[PDB]
Copies of this chain bind each other. A is one copy, B any other.
Amino acid sequence: TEFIRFSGVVNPRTISGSNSVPSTQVADARIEYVGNGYINEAQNMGWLQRFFLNLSPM
């Protein structure tokens, strides 16, 4: 399952005639595109590898 979430503030005069506004005209734009399932877990680092990436000398 994939989730696309959007939030922001829109000026009414930036909305086009077809009730559309580009995402670059939204003030506090919060855009999120995430997923779950084993596909999403396959894109997470292992805990040991994350620990090393954060605490290894090099």
Chain A residues with a Cβ under 8 A of chain B: 11, 14, 19, 38, 41-42, 45-50, 53-54, 56-58
Contacts and interface: CB of A to CB of B under 8 A. Distances in A.
Count of identical protomers in the assembly: 6
A48 B58 contact: yes
Given A41-B53, A53-B41, A46 B58 contact: yes
A35 to B, nearest CB: 14
B54 A58 contact: no
Contacts of A19: 11, 14
Contact of A46 (B14, B45, B49, B56): B56
B54 A41 contact: yes
A16 to B, nearest CB: 12
